[PDB]
């Protein structure tokens, strides 16, 4: 039978739980889960758009860590330790 999993929900319920626990949150509710899907998704497209812009500029149709770190810089959050 044909199958195609949901993917977007692939961030498992315990994944959200210990994300929050690392974040110091103690008590969580239910719709937090879908809301976090939404938040992760929207945060993802912005950096993806910046990265694809740099990939197009670089004449290459593959992504590179340099372009990634430049993109994160552009959205205004410095990530270090990767040479960028």
């Amino acid at each position: 039978r044909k199958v195609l999993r949901d993917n977007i929900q692939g961030i498992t319920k315990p994944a959200i739980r210990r994300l929050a626990r690392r974040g110091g949150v103690k008590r969580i509710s239910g719709l937090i889960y879908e809301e976090t899907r939404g938040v992760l998704k929207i945060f993802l497209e912005n950096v993806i758009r910046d990265a694809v812009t740099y990939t197009e500029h670089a004449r290459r149709k593959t992504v590179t860590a340099m372009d990634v770190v430049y993109a994160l810089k552009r959205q205004g959050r410095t990530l270090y330790g990767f040479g960028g």
Partner: peptide, 20 residues
């Protein structure tokens, strides 16, 4: 489009940072 291990790792770190 095409990514690599380093790009995936950087995206992972960024997502973790934003979520936290």
């Amino acid at each position: 489009l095409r990514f690599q291990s380093s790009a995936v790792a950087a995206l992972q770190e960024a997502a973790e940072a934003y979520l936290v």
